[PDB]
Structure to design on (1766 residues):
């Protein structure tokens, strides 16, 4: 599914991600923008045997089990395929676990490069929230 | 310390030990089931063509029953004469000959050993000795009687004919129901948590049956005066319990069609239950016809096999009446449901009382036919037949203790 | 179209009604002119019509529950139905023919738990006022054997 | 013989005693229907006229019922006609008991008061002139009550419940059951062992510390009391967790006794562990199976806060008890360990060859006591 | 709205945790201030409050698994849960009250399989961090009988 | 995208096929180069490879059904599969691994019903030409014991 | 008139009562399983390290078998000398010493009582009397013999060595298959609805092999034979689709022998069927039930391709075996077919009244052998 910017804002707010561990809603929308371009099917094969899955590009070595990643730890205890659906639930619940791991949103390289200390609240203006 | 000690010649007292003594159960297999009785096997219409067979039991002993090309029915013990394996492994089928799976010994439909695999050895080595003769090895054959389509078997060649065993009055009561071709409309098994005897006593228990019937007329569902009676053959082993209206006397349910029925007998009989020692029942309850087969399984368990019947000439509307009235009978029967449980109530109630006696005094100490059903004459009859087969009449020492005197006449 | 989810939801409400001994509500799962039967694989394979229970109307089901309450003697027990997912063989927006696997545990008041029956429901479903209803339910039991008796329907 | 005793003393028990079926039937005649008191139920379970429960004395089913005189009666749950159970319900309230088979009626004493079709039907059949109801009936039991406990015996010769218990057991029961109690739950355990292995285990002061491991994984003095017959005992004790509230308790006994387990031959247990009160009933079922019925108790006067303490402390006891869980299995470990050893003997020598009271609990004196009482009832005692 | 599919998914993860002997994870299915109880239909019908297991906190559940690992002696065995479809009585996007039928097989390390328990879970669900959580689970067993002992919770 | 709904529907059709004696259709649930094995928890925990059934091709499954029909002697009996919900362990856009709890009743032609096996299917699923198919099914039985023999696959 | 009355000195007739008499079954426990036999316990490779143990049975009697630091294997009755509880509760494990859970009595790996909880009392009081001596209490120890990795146990001080008990011909036939290190590739148990003897007779039944099993005839009389040891108790029977690979094999035996079944009284089987190797242990459980424990074997040196051939050929054996499936049911067919015939006799006349070796397999000589050994152990001769 390709989300609308505001469609995704509303959806992330409904799954309790406004200010989840200090991170305003704009950080999450901005993150999805530069990780996946709002695409729930985005996948990115890495050269280390791992793949990043879905709207928030969650990694198959630490977080989800894709069944082809050596050393898989599956800390969100889900299959990576759950992170490729139209419904963002499994990706949000995993993201909440990642962002609580101790390194906040820096887990997300695209967020770090393109979002972190910008005007992130620009990603949620012109939206019904 | 014998818990199977009979109190006297009379059957008004039954030792509760008779329902739990395992040595006595094995004696029932030798002296009843493989003695001078007729065991109900199946209906001839269930094996109509040459080669059609069913497997069943006579007591604990597995049986094959089979139709041959002469249109006769044969029966034999389902035991290979080699090392004892069941010969026929299916409940039913059609075959030319029976072959044991273990070492391929062959039997014809009479149960004769016709073939022994590698009887003559291979390359002049092994097989049977010169002295071995096939015709000297075989399962026990049964004497077979077919009476109004009912196939019985005995292990004894000295058993009376089925006609003498039943007697005239039971013969007529079977013929009355099995007067024209019948069709199986269903089969169901009940596993009873009781010694077989408690169920067979219950079939013969006109006291319980008449109490339960009198309750069902509380609901006012017929409203027509009835008279009942009990018939007991000379041996005691067989009974009929009936109820009837007098054709041409003057004067709850949201679907009354459960009890809507049709006249189809030349008499007023609304209910007839008929027992043949040691485990056959034929029932007519309004238009509900069935056969039951009772088998012993373990000291405290037995099997009741129902065969539901219609007549081959039934219309759609007559057959539907029987399918509705079947709700009265079987495992979930409005009438018979509790028949599955009362045996077990006795089996459990007597748990601490193996040394005590049932009291069976209703209608006196007779084992003959009676007007009315507030009697246990047909239950006492069962014990009369049982003790004769089992050799448990007053013998020797205790007879001597009663009779060693000289009264003034 | 009637689907596997609506039938599974219906089958859970049917099981809960029978397992809670709210037996008065069991006939409401059926059309006025329904068929209900409890039979076994041998009878069904040979085409034998008789049932341990046999009903061709909702009224016959209501009478069977009256008789259970006000007439039948049996030792106290309950059922536990465990159902599989249904398969639809044919149907449209309003009718469907469907098979549902079942197992029924019997628990005696004295504590014994036994597998009492297993098999499949062979069902014909219709839609009355937007709600699923059984035109027909045949409980085809895997075993020819009923332990002791059958008081509650399957 | 696999039930041959090897001496007058009880330091050796023949393992055959747990598998010999003839000896089991003798236990039904000489123990359960002999000179014992069988625990039936609590008075608070049958408070009003007509209230009844069904239960067992050994293999024999029993009805226990309250009558309008406020007395409790008990009789064999066996119809005097053809032997059917009379009462089919675990509990209820009734004017009279009726056998469902042929509608024979019994009063609350177990007297035959009615026989269906006694005089025949339309002047045909029925009983002979010589039949008299008053000559047919289930065996009645003697009933005794003690601080809310209801016991039954088949024997005219059994001593009074006070003499049968003896003073020390009487005082130790009264200490717990000094005010009205209320059932707060019932659970049954089916034990894969001969009854005796569970009753021995209750009396096994030695194992209580070693089998259990709960207090020791995560000083106070104790003792064992044995009555004069040997059949009854008391084992007593007197002065990590993320939710310590499991063991938070309140004072409610005059003494400082924090544990009291009490047994009455042949199958009664009263337990007090902190504020956890319960009764157990042990019944034989088959040579290698038995039934343990728990009745968990509060006092009728408990506050909500006291009752909550008992509901939390109940985690210590029963089928899943932090303490009692193992008690359900060790019997079966014995039953199976002795499979090849029917001809060998248990060794019970801890605390000597004594069957009397002891300071300390590193003894098997209450286990030997059980065998002393058992051999007396069973006619197996040998002379010293 | 919380629906029957989300509750069934929850119930399957709970069963998988208990049946795999990942017992350390069992308390995480409950709220901090949860109620868990194992009881039977007789106790439940009479309103008797005691459980074979009785917990009014997640910490009590954690201690019961500590005790099972470090302290309790029992013969090795496993559970196999077979669950029915839940029935929701009430609830919303966050809370639900539901009943779920269950059966538990016990398999001893020595090979014997028995029906060890059956009944229904009477549950109160809440949502924490977007995940279903039991505020309350009462395992109402059909039988008053536990064979031998109960080591693993239901 | 393989999901829990597709696998539940698949598992029901597999169970229906095996329970109905349409055993000829059982191999069509698998890829050409599939693995099927029936094993137990002990073997699976120690990493022991052998199965009471062991197939590394669809053809070996077809041979097993031929032998069952034309060659093997066993007393007539039937299975009743009661399945849990599938739980997906691993997946990407196209493949999935899943575990499904099962229980299998055996019903002898003579009427005896026993719990014959229980455990989980450890599965690898693929979709070829619109058809969901097992690349792998390992039936991990809870018990090391098979009563009498195993004629029908689980 | 006894149902266990033998009708002659020879074994051409077996009383069907022998399969249902419970008193006679208890005599089997005293005179066979705890008498002058060797009971198969496990393979040495299943308890390779110090402390490794398994629990099993010799007849009805539970056994612990365990490796000690000397690399020797010990076995003892799994019965605490206090009040009789199982000592070891696990099917297998590794331990320094065994402790009974009931009252914490400790045993070393020989089964000697090393410790009694509160032996000397607690504070002043209780404990054992002065006269109590640990060294006088212990479960029965078993004699252990290891032959080609096979671990046997006996209760009897008088049983000959395992070599003499087997005799040379069985010794060589075991060596032929267990000539190199083996690896367990799987364990399965079959619960048989028959008296143990019906299964042990079946293993020895060269007559049935080709007739019960249409796989043995349809896809395979061939060169072969039946060997019976001097006692009669032990035998050898030997012989020489869309995916044909089920039966594709490789040569690995010097002789041409594609089948060798070997039985050792009273419940051990070693099988070689092409490349399918296995051990079976037969245990009595009740009068009409027994347990067959399968241990499937590869050789440690197998390649991937050889190991795969054994995993495919294992479809022939075990509970679902194209061959052995029937062996699980035929015992019960006999158990049930004789239900009314406790007083009648099996007829075992094929190949005469011989209990010796034979160059054909259309004989029951190895079945008669079993009954010769049985009657000697049981005191039922003539
Ligand atoms: O076993 C039965 O169904 C039965 C037995 C007797 C009678 C009768 O005597 O009226 C009726 C029914
Ligand atoms: O069976 C029991 O629960 C029990 C028995 C004895 C003791 C003890 O001696 O401390 C405690 C509890
Ligand atoms: O148990 C077996 O697998 C088996 C037994 C005997 C024979 C034989 O003697 O040919 C072959 C196989
Ligand atoms: S047992 Fe029938 S041929 Fe051998
Ligand atoms: S058995 Fe009770 S009234 Fe007949
Ligand atoms: S039974 Fe083993 S230490 Fe007591
Ligand atoms: Fe204890
Ligand atoms: Fe064979």
């Amino acid at each position: 599914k390709v989300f609308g910017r505001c469609e995704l804002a509303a959806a992330m707010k409904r799954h309790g991600l406004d200010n989840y561990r200090g991170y305003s809603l704009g950080n999450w929308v901005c993150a999805a923008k530069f990780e996946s371009n709002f695409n729930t099917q985005a996948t990115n094969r890495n050269t280390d045997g791992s793949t990043d899955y879905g709207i928030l590009q969650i990694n198959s070595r630490w977080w989800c089990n894709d069944g082809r990643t050596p050393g898989s730890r599956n800390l969100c205890n889900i299959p990576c395929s759950a992170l490729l659906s139209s419904d963002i639930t499994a990706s949000v619940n995993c993201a909440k676990k990642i962002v609580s791991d101790g390194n906040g949103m820096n887990a997300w390289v695209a967020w770090r490069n393109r979002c972190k200390g910008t005007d992130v609240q620009a990603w949620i203006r012109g939206c019904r929230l | 310390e014998s818990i199977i000690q009979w109190h006297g010649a009379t059957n008004t007292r039954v030792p509760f030990g008779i329902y739990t003594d395992t040595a006595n159960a094995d004696q029932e297999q030798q002296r009843i089931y493989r003695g001078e009785v007729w065991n109900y096997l199946c209906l001839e219409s269930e094996i109509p063509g040459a080669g059609d067979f069913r497997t069943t039991f006579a007591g604990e002993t597995p049986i094959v029953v089979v139709r041959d090309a002469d249109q006769e029915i044969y029966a034999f013990e389902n035991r290979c004469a080699h090392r004892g394996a069941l010969i026929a492994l299916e409940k039913s089928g059609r075959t030319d000959s029976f072959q044991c799976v273990y070492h391929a010994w062959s039997y014809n439909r009479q149960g004769d050993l016709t073939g022994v695999a590698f009887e003559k050895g291979v390359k002049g080595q092994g097989g049977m000795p010169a002295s071995f003769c096939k015709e000297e090895h075989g399962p026990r054959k049964l004497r077979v009687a077919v009476f109004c389509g009912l196939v019985f078997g005995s292990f004894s060649e000295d058993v009376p004919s089925i006609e003498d065993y039943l007697g005239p009055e039971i013969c007529e009561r079977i013929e009355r129901v099995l007067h024209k071709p019948v069709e199986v409309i269903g089969r169901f098994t009940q596993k009873l948590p009781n010694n077989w005897k408690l169920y067979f006593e219950n079939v013969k228990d006109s006291y319980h049956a008449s109490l339960l019937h009198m309750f069902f007329t509380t609901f006012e569902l017929n409203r027509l005066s009835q008279k009942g009676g009990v018939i007991v053959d000379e041996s005691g082993g067989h009974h009929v319990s009936y109820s009837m209206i007098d054709r041409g006397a003057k004067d709850r349910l949201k679907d009354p069609s459960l009890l809507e029925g049709f006249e189809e007998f030349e008499d007023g009989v609304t209910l007839q239950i008929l027992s043949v020692f040691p485990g056959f029942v034929l029932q007519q309850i309004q238009n509900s016809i069935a056969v039951r087969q009772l088998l012993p399984k373990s000291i405290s368990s037995s099997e009741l096999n129902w065969t539901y019947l219609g007549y081959a000439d039934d219309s759609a509307e007559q057959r539907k009446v029987r399918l509705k009235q079947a709700n009265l009978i079987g495992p979930a029967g409005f009438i018979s449901m509790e028949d599955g449980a009362v045996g077990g109530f006795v089996q459990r109630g007597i748990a601490g009382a193996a040394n005590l006696d049932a009291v069976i005094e209703m209608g006196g100490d007779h084992e003959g036919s009676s007007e009315g059903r507030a009697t246990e004459t047909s239950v006492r009859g069962f014990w009369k037949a049982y003790r004769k087969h089992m050799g448990q009449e007053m013998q020797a020492e205790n007879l001597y203790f009663q009779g060693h005197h000289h009264h003034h006449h | 179209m009637i689907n596997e989810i609506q039938i599974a939801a219906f089958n859970a409400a049917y099981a809960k009604t029978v397992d809670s001994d709210a037996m008065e509500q069991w006939p409401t799962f059926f059309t006025k002119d329904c068929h209900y039967r409890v039979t076994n694989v041998d009878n069904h394979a040979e085409g034998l019509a008789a049932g341990i229970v046999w009903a061709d109307s909702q009224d016959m089901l209501t009478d069977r529950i009256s008789a259970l309450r006000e007439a039948n003697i049996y030792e106290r027990h309950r059922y536990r139905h465990i159902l599989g997912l249904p398969s639809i063989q044919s149907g449209d927006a309003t009718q469907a023919s469907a098979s549902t696997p079942f197992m029924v545990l019997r628990i005696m008041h004295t504590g014994e738990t036994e597998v009492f029956a297993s098999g499949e429901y062979l069902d014909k479903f219709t839609t009355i006022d937007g709600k699923l209803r059984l035109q027909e339910r045949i409980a085809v039991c895997d075993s020819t054997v009923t332990d002791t008796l059958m008081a509650l329907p399957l």
